[PDB]
Design an enzyme around this catalytic site. Structure first.
Site, mmCIF file in Angstrom:
data_model
loop_
_atom_site.group_PDB
_atom_site.id
_atom_site.type_symbol
_atom_site.label_atom_id
_atom_site.label_comp_id
_atom_site.label_asym_id
_atom_site.label_seq_id
_atom_site.Cartn_x
_atom_site.Cartn_y
_atom_site.Cartn_z
ATOM 1 N N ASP A 111 -34.627 -4.162 -7.008
ATOM 2 C CA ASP A 111 -35.812 -3.334 -7.177
ATOM 3 C C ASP A 111 -35.786 -2.105 -6.273
ATOM 4 O O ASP A 111 -36.821 -1.465 -6.073
ATOM 5 C CB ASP A 111 -37.073 -4.146 -6.894
ATOM 6 C CG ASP A 111 -37.139 -4.651 -5.457
ATOM 7 O OD1 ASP A 111 -36.202 -4.394 -4.650
ATOM 8 O OD2 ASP A 111 -38.128 -5.345 -5.137
ATOM 9 N N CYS A 150 -33.434 -3.778 -1.721
ATOM 10 C CA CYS A 150 -32.599 -4.925 -1.370
ATOM 11 C C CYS A 150 -32.088 -4.873 0.072
ATOM 12 O O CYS A 150 -31.920 -5.928 0.698
ATOM 13 C CB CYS A 150 -31.414 -5.038 -2.342
ATOM 14 S SG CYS A 150 -30.417 -3.535 -2.383
ATOM 15 N N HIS A 166 -15.161 -4.563 6.662
ATOM 16 C CA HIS A 166 -16.562 -4.591 7.046
ATOM 17 C C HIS A 166 -16.899 -3.403 7.934
ATOM 18 O O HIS A 166 -16.024 -2.731 8.488
ATOM 19 C CB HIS A 166 -16.928 -5.876 7.794
ATOM 20 C CG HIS A 166 -16.286 -5.986 9.138
ATOM 21 N ND1 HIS A 166 -15.004 -6.465 9.313
ATOM 22 C CD2 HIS A 166 -16.743 -5.673 10.374
ATOM 23 C CE1 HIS A 166 -14.700 -6.440 10.598
ATOM 24 N NE2 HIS A 166 -15.738 -5.965 11.263
ATOM 25 N N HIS A 169 -25.850 -2.341 -4.176
ATOM 26 C CA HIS A 169 -26.673 -3.527 -3.968
ATOM 27 C C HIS A 169 -26.306 -4.316 -2.705
ATOM 28 O O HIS A 169 -25.125 -4.534 -2.415
ATOM 29 C CB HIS A 169 -26.574 -4.467 -5.184
ATOM 30 C CG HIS A 169 -27.632 -5.514 -5.184
ATOM 31 N ND1 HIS A 169 -28.891 -5.293 -5.701
ATOM 32 C CD2 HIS A 169 -27.653 -6.758 -4.651
ATOM 33 C CE1 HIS A 169 -29.629 -6.376 -5.525
ATOM 34 N NE2 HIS A 169 -28.902 -7.277 -4.885
#
Lengths: 241, 76
Positions: free
Chosen positions: A46, A49, A216, A234
């Site tokens: 939405d 996140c 990462h 996302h």
């Protein structure tokens, strides 16, 4: 549409099911992720996140760690953020409920008193609109305050990203609910609260083909105790092994 | 020549380049020094994002110019 803001813990295999007719790079990276991580917890697509993932990750960390000293520390940082918002011209009427709702959740996950809550009720609250969205909005205000407080430092990054001034960026891209976040938001939130974040970057990137790993990015205002999965577009929550 | 790349943590990466270096080449140099995959880098010079195709002269990035680096982390 029907999905909760925050899902249940899921084995990493559910992630591999999303890509088993896509790229082999991604399937191999998900294999390795399974090597390093037990589970993931999805958040709803939405636009919120990153903040939703951070909110649940952090509240659950306090729940399971019961680290009252970390809570004292962050409460001091939150007071400082209230002061910089005021110094920027925000009156308390515009943000007070966001701060008080988050502080209530933070105090609730600490055990041993009248209004202590467990994991099931914590998931209930992070799934409830009138609590979860208000906490997201708290994090957006904190982010916006830290970006404007450091306007001069963030200016060239933001104007390259968006051809906006720092205040325009804060108003249009940080404060509105549903606005996606990016690198500047994460740095600002992590610094403003002093909580570190590890973002595992799940994409098709490779340098030696046949030598692929999940890279990462660390935000360290000592491995970060908040770990998020990023795929392009996302954010979700990861649980270490 | 030398250029500088500022990052969102306040760090400066110094690089050795020529005006005929690709933006791809510069990102590969940044990966060499920082371990950031070039796919994940966004490079800015003077309010404009630098395109992988063009080169340093196209953006007129001269001696000891300063670029800015942002990671590709947009997400909802």
């Amino acid at each position: 549409s029907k999905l909760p803001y925050v899902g249940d813990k899921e084995p990493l295999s559910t992630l591999a099911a999303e890509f088993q007719s896509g790229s082999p790079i991604l399937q191999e990276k998900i294999k390795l992720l399974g090597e390093q991580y037990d589970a993931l917890r999805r958040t709803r697509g939405d636009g919120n996140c990153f903040y939703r993932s951070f909110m649940f990750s952090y509240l659950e960390h306090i729940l399971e760690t019961q680290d009252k000293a970390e809570v004292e520390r962050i409460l001091k940082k939150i007071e400082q953020c209230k002061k910089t918002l005021a110094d920027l011209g925000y009156i308390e009427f515009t943000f007070e409920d966001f701060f008080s709702i988050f502080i209530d959740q933070l105090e609730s996950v600490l055990q041993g008193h009248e209004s202590s809550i467990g994991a099931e009720e914590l998931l209930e609250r992070t799934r409830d609109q009138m609590v979860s969205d208000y906490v997201v909005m708290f994090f957006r205000f904190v982010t916006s305050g830290e970006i404007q407080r450091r306007a001069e430092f963030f200016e060239p990054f933001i104007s390259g990203l968006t051809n906006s001034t720092v205040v325009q960026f804060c108003k249009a891209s940080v404060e509105p609910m549903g606005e996606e976040s990016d690198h500047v938001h994460i740095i600002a939130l992590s610094d403003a609260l002093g909580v570190p974040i590890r973002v595992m970057y799940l994409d098709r990137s490779s340098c030696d083909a046949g030598n692929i790993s999940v890279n990462h990015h660390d935000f360290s205002p000592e491995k970060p105790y908040i770990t998020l999965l990023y795929r392009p577009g996302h954010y979700d929550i990861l649980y270490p092994k | 020549m030398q250029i500088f790349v500022k990052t969102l943590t306040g760090k400066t990466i110094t690089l050795e380049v020529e005006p005929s270096d690709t933006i791809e080449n510069v990102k590969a140099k940044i990966q060499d020094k920082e371990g950031i995959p070039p796919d994940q880098q966004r490079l800015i010079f003077a309010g404009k994002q630098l395109e992988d195709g063009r080169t340093l002269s196209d953006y007129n990035i001269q001696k000891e110019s300063t670029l800015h680096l942002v990671l590709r982390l947009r997400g909802g």
